[PDB]
Design a protein around this ligand. Structure first.
Ligand code: MG
Ligand code: MG
Lengths: 286, 290
């Protein structure tokens, strides 16, 4: 067993594992919650003895207890070329507000009066062991698994209200994560995964993680010199070309009624409906 | 449910802190018989506790972060009018925001460990705001009602990592030990007006920063209201609201920075005091802070 998930309504999710047929099996008999500490027991469990889940439940964020999210800026060489930007010599880092975390298929709500909402399919890395000044040679051994991410962005809030990108990155619902935490033995080389994203069934982003400027090991090593990564932390590693902001002749942005569909090889798929802003009340996402 | 305010704290070694309240004589009183931990959800029961009945805490225990469960830290850039004048910077038309990585959180008097090869370490005394109720597109008129209390903060900064390794400030703000918070979570009825509090920070006994929150450009209510349109603030979240003039980076004729052996001492009216000793980098191993 190498694909883990969390299923059910928000705030009520249960731990699960994806069997060889693609069905969810309930892990509640083995571990109470899918946390990083629970991975060893969930990885050792006998799948054929776990009950099948009924009712076609919602996928939640596949790991409970993500403490913070570190985000990487320009990190695809073919993206740098398409934007006519220089190759960064060290990775741009910014924080992806934890309150943006959402389920993989959950509704994406555009911010108030937003006309610059944008998509960013990204490889997410979930840390398994504390990363504090870790060498590049040892970095990948600190990884618990990989996840599919959409780094949803508001380009006006990101770039036209100051120099700090996080202002356009932390909105409610702007970090769909999942549906699977896939352990490294199943993922293989994280630097050979096909990546894609469509909007309304029209392909917008195509790439492969081989063209990352800083690979996952380089990113973990660098980040750990500035910000300690603890088990459960998520790092989102940048996006290939094809974001709406870069479309020619004119940029293309998200609008109400759009449907985003994205996937990364071995990490499953996401589908989000995009809705216009409304006041989301006392809802606590994640 | 009285309207006189409270000074809450957490006391003990790391990972073993207990909930406390400060009495009028400055003693710590043990709250463990009333609530098991000093969380936001615990505040209701904690504020109704009769201080005179609680045990005196003996000895001089370490103060921890005064509230458990801070989920994230939102930080403001330039936000004191006198700082804008001393730096000859424009008065902002909207607040600069960045995120202070949660792993920088530390107790109020805990050692500050400089990152590797740091010669640009710097101090920033700030008024911290702990959120008590969810803030989502909240108006200025209702913002302060969402506040659980106020805390003293040092927004410790590595100016080279902050500004000379790219444009994103968080890279020089998230280092281990770079957000000492405390010693007290002070509820609004005790603080009074948050926009009339004296602020200071000394380094090795020499006064570096002097100010008063009356010169804030965006007041606390305006900051909460603005931030809440871009990022939802949940109970327990911390917002650090900027710093008065006198940071080391701004000293004339030459900037002055932290070095191993330096002592930072800071305070804000009604919020207590902090003291941090500064150390050269070492590998902190598997230690967890906060
Ligand atoms: Mg991104
Ligand atoms: Mg500051």
């Amino acid at each position: 067993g190498s694909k883990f998930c969390r299923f059910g309504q928000r705030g009520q999710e249960k731990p699960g594992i994806i069997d060889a047929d693609g069905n969810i099996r309930d892990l509640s008999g083995v571990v109470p919650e899918l946390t990083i500490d629970a991975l060893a027991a969930a990885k050792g469990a006998d799948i054929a003895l776990l009950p099948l889940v009924e009712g076609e439940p919602r996928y939640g964020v596949p790991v409970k207890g993500i403490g913070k999210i570190v985000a990487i800026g320009l990190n695809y060489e073919d993206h740098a070329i398409e934007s006519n930007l220089p190759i960064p010599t060290e990775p741009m880092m910014f924080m992806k507000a934890l309150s943006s975390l959402n389920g993989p298929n959950d509704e994406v709500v555009l911010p108030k009066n937003s006309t610059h909402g944008d998509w960013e399919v990204e490889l997410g890395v979930v840390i398994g062991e504390t990363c504090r000044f870790v060498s590049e040679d040892e970095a990948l051994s600190k990884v618990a698994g990989y996840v599919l991410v959409n780094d949803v962005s508001e380009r006006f809030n990101q770039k036209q209200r100051g120099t700090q990108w996080s202002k356009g990155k932390g909105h409610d619902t702007f970090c769909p994560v999942g549906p699977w935490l896939v352990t490294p033995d199943e993922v293989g080389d994280p630097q050979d995964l096909d990546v894609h994203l469509d909007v309304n069934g029209e392909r917008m982003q195509t790439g492969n993680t081989k063209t990352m400027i800083f690979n996952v090991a380089q990113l973990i090593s660098y980040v750990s010199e500035y910000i300690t990564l603890y088990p459960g932390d998520l790092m989102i590693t940048g996006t290939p070309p094809g974001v709406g902001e870069g479309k020619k002749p004119q940029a293309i942005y998200l609008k109400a009624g759009d449907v985003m569909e994205l996937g990364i090889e071995k990490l499953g798929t996401q589908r989000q409906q995009v809705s216009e802003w409304r006041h989301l009340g006392d809802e606590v996402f994640g």
